[PDB]
Amino acid sequence: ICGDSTECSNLLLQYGSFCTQLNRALTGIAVEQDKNTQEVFAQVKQIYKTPPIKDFGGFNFSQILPDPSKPSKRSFIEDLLFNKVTFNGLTVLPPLLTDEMIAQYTSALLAGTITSGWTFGAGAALQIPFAMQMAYRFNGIGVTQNVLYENQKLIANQFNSAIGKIQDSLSSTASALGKLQDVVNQNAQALNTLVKQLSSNFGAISSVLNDILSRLDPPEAEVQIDRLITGRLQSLQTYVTQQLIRAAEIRASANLAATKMSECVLGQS
Amino acid sequence: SSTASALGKLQDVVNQNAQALNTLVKQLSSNFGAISSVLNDILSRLDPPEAEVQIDRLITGRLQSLQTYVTQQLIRAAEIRASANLAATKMSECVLGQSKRVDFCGKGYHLMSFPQSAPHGVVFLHVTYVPAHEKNFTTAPAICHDGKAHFPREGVFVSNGTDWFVTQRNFYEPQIITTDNTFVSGNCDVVIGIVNNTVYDPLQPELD
Amino acid sequence: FQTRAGCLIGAEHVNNSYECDIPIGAGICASYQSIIAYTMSLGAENSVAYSNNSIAIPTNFTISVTTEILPVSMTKTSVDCTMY
Ligand SMILES: *[C@@H]1O[C@H](CO)[C@@H](O[C@@H]2O[C@H](CO)[C@@H](O)[C@H](O)[C@H]2NC(C)=O)[C@H](O)[C@H]1NC(C)=O
Ligand SMILES: *[C@@H]1O[C@H](CO)[C@@H](O[C@@H]2O[C@H](CO)[C@@H](O)[C@H](O)[C@H]2NC(C)=O)[C@H](O)[C@H]1NC(C)=O
Ligand SMILES: *[C@@H]1O[C@H](CO)[C@@H](O[C@@H]2O[C@H](CO)[C@@H](O)[C@H](O)[C@H]2NC(C)=O)[C@H](O)[C@H]1NC(C)=O
Ligand SMILES: *[C@@H]1O[C@H](CO)[C@@H](O[C@@H]2O[C@H](CO)[C@@H](O)[C@H](O)[C@H]2NC(C)=O)[C@H](O)[C@H]1NC(C)=O
Ligand SMILES: *[C@@H]1O[C@H](CO)[C@@H](O[C@@H]2O[C@H](CO)[C@@H](O)[C@H](O)[C@H]2NC(C)=O)[C@H](O)[C@H]1NC(C)=O
Ligand SMILES: *[C@@H]1O[C@H](CO)[C@@H](O[C@@H]2O[C@H](CO)[C@@H](O)[C@H](O)[C@H]2NC(C)=O)[C@H](O)[C@H]1NC(C)=O
Numbered sequence: 226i227c228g229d230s231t232e233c234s235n236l237l238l239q240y241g242s243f244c245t246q247l248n249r250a251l252t253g254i255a256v257e258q259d260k261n262t263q264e265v266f267a268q269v270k271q272i273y274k275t276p277p278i279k280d281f282g283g284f285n286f287s288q289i290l291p292d293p294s295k296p297s298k299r300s301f302i303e304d305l306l307f308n309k310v311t312f313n314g315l316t317v318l319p320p321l322l323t324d325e326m327i328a329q330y331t332s333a334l335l336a337g338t339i340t341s342g343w344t345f346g347a348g349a350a351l352q353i354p355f356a357m358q359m360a361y362r363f364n365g366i367g368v369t370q371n372v373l374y375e376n377q378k379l380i381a382n383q384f385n386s387a388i389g390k391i392q393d394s395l396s397s398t399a400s401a402l403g404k405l406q407d408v409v410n411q412n413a414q415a416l417n418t419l420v421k422q423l424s425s426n427f428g429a430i431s432s433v434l435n436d437i438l439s440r441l442d443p444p445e446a447e448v449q450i451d452r453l454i455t456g457r458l459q460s461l462q463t464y465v466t467q468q469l470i471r472a473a474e475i476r477a478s479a480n481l482a483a484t485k486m487s488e489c490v491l492g493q494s
Numbered sequence: 495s496s497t498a499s500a501l502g503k504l505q506d507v508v509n510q511n512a513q514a515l516n517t518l519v520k521q522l523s524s525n526f527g528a529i530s531s532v533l534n535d536i537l538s539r540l541d542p543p544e545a546e547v548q549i550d551r552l553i554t555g556r557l558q559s560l561q562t563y564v565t566q567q568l569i570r571a572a573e574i575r576a577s578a579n580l581a582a583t584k585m586s587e588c589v590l591g592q593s594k595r596v597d598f599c600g601k602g603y604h605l606m607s608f609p610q611s612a613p614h615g616v617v618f619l620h621v622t623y624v625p626a627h628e629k630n631f632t633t634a635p636a637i638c639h640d641g642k643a644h645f646p647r648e649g650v651f652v653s654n655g656t657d658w659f660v661t662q663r664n665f666y667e668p669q670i671i672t673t674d675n676t677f678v679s680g681n682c683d684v685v686i687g688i689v690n691n692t693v694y695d696p697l698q699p700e701l702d
Numbered sequence: 703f704q705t706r707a708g709c710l711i712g713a714e715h716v717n718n719s720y721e722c723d724i725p726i727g728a729g730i731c732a733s734y735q736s737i738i739a740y741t742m743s744l745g746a747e748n749s750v751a752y753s754n755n756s757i758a759i760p761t762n763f764t765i766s767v768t769t770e771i772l773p774v775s776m777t778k779t780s781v782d783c784t785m786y
């Protein structure tokens with residue numbers, strides 16, 4: 226609002242506390258973001274690791290497991306996803322969990338569900354050969370385990386073809402990640418309009434404080450200062466309210482994602 | 495009984511409401527650019543044709559503060575309603591019945607739940623079953639006998655080095671293999687992992 | 703100490719890693735011993751003994767009771783304009 230002007234600071238000081246009130250909302254927003262990420266991804270207690278030899282009955286997970294050669298330790302699909310997507314008193318704070326930690330959580334979850342079935346979500350992980358876990362799941366959907374054992378190779382080939390096709394479709398066709406792009410664009414546009422609002426007269430004679438101070442006498446310049454102050458404060462309030470609404474909707478989506486991870490990954494729904 | 499801060503959520507709600515009320519009532523002591531913060535002073539110092547401007551400034555400032563307070567209250571009420579709907583679903587699904595969706599109520603296999611009243615909320619006590627003291631075993635997906643393949647009706651084949659019993663999947667309880675807890679499907683030439691063994695039946699010993 | 707979050711004075715950087723209690727940011731946080739800052743650890747690491755012909759079966763059980771607390775209501779308030 227003031228931009229290093231003592232007169233503006235003194236004039237603004239007589240509006241009481243609107244600013245602690247404003248910052249107390251942004252702080253809550255940031256803490257909520259961190260809690261969202263933590264409650265979505267930190268579903269496990271130990272970091273599981275896949276065995277060096279990989280013979281999962283013919284199923285081929287090589288496209289999803291992490292690749293130690295790459296420094297990021299991300300997988301093929303994660304790299305495709307990451308590549309596919311694109312100072313005036315404002316600060317951006319880094320998230321608590323870096324991307325390597327999130328990748329490590331995903332890798333732990335995925336190795337656990339490959340090796341131990343769904344048992345690792347209740348107590349301690351218990352090993353089980355993968356084909357037997359598939360037989361259990363077939364029994365779960367109302368089909369006898371006979372069918373799986375009598376058709377293992379065909380099922381494995383169909384799974385591998387499906388995973389290859391999904392990789393190819395994600396690699397070639399764009400615009401498949403519209404939601405995250407929309408979120409990013411909305412946030413960037415909000416910041417852009419907030420910073421652009423700084424160049425409006427708001428009924429004053431100029432949009433820069435130095436000209437106001439260096440062209441008139443303070444008893445009459447204070448009027449223009451007041452107009453600028455009230456306009457900028459109004460814009461800030463609108464921005465904060467929009468941020469609160471958007472944060473509420475993101476929290477709803479995060480809760481849904483957490484329930485999906487708990488139910489459809491740690492068990493059979 | 496001993497550990498405190500176990501009820502952080504309700505305390506947070508109460509503190510948020512109290513602080514909002516406190517700042518709303520504290521906002522009454524701001525000039526908002528006028529000459530004073532009390533109406534009687536400006537009334538008893540200036541002639542009304544010029545005091546009406548200061549009165550207008552106070553009016554607009556206080557009205558804006560009230561508007562912001564009401565909007566914040568609406569946001570918080572929406573969030574609380576979401577939480578109340580979640581609590582109602584939990585009380586309907588985990589108290590009036592045994593829930594099957596994993597991790598909805600309790601960290602483990604759900605058994606039952608009990609409600610307790612709280613000053614502005616509810617407390618659920620979830621009773622859950624957790625396995626422990628596991629053991630290693632060797633496994634096979636089917637048993638070839640007389641050229642046919644046998645699969646377990648319900649359970650899994652295990653062996654303590656030998657003797658190949660069947661158990662249930664969540665509690666070690668070995669049992670001999672009989673034609674009553676297994677079923678047959680095809681010949682033992684296509685499955686990958688079958689082992690040779692014998693399957694006993696009671697009709698022949700009952701015959702003699 | 704200089705980190706991706708900024709600059710930290712009054713703490714000693716170590717090479718160990720423990721659980722996080724006072725989150726600082728960019729994957730680091732601090733704790734009291736003096737005050738030490740470190741890289742947070744995501745938890746203990748174990749390698750489950752996978753094999754294509756081996757399983758594990760529990761032999762005993764435990765019964766656990768846990769709590770969860772939910773808010774359901776807030777205080778009902780009303781405001782009169784003209785008085786305010
Ligand atoms: C699992 O699938 C991957 C492909 O996604 C296989 O890796 C390919 O193997 C062929 C055969 O030599 C090579 O020509 C490709 O260059 C490999 N691709 C990559 C990305 O390395 C892999 O062999 C499969 N797993 C098994 C056990 O066969
Ligand atoms: C596997 O378990 C079976 C069932 O308990 C064992 O069979 C009996 O074990 C007892 C205990 O030593 C012996 O006294 C009996 O003679 C066994 N019965 C038969 C028919 O052999 C079996 O010994 C166990 N095997 C191992 C390697 O632990
Ligand atoms: C399960 O894993 C074992 C590894 O212990 C596999 O046994 C190997 O089979 C190949 C091909 O038949 C042989 O070349 C290896 O020498 C075997 N390993 C050992 C240690 O003998 C086995 O094929 C896998 N699958 C099944 C169904 O048992
Ligand atoms: C289970 O028993 C059958 C026969 O009782 C075994 O089948 C024999 O296998 C050997 C080696 O492959 C062949 O030379 C014989 O001709 C087979 N005989 C018959 C009648 O099929 C079978 O190998 C045994 N299972 C295992 C795992 O060894
Ligand atoms: C089950 O069998 C494994 C195989 O020998 C036992 O040994 C463990 O194997 C894993 C994977 O190689 C190692 O990470 C552990 O360190 C091994 N244990 C020990 C004590 O060294 C294992 O102990 C057996 N029991 C269980 C409950 O898994
Ligand atoms: C299952 O676990 C329970 C509890 O850990 C065991 O009961 C304990 O047994 C020991 C030895 O007999 C006693 O000293 C304890 O007092 C018992 N605890 C309780 C709460 O009664 C039980 O023996 C275990 N059963 C098996 C088969 O492992």
Ligand SMILES: *[C@@H]1O[C@H](CO)[C@@H](O)[C@H](O)[C@H]1NC(C)=O
Pocket residue numbers: 714715716717
């Ligand atoms: C231990 O940490 C210090 C700085 O805290 C660093 O200079 C030193 O190289 C580290 N040593 C090892 C073995 O990591």
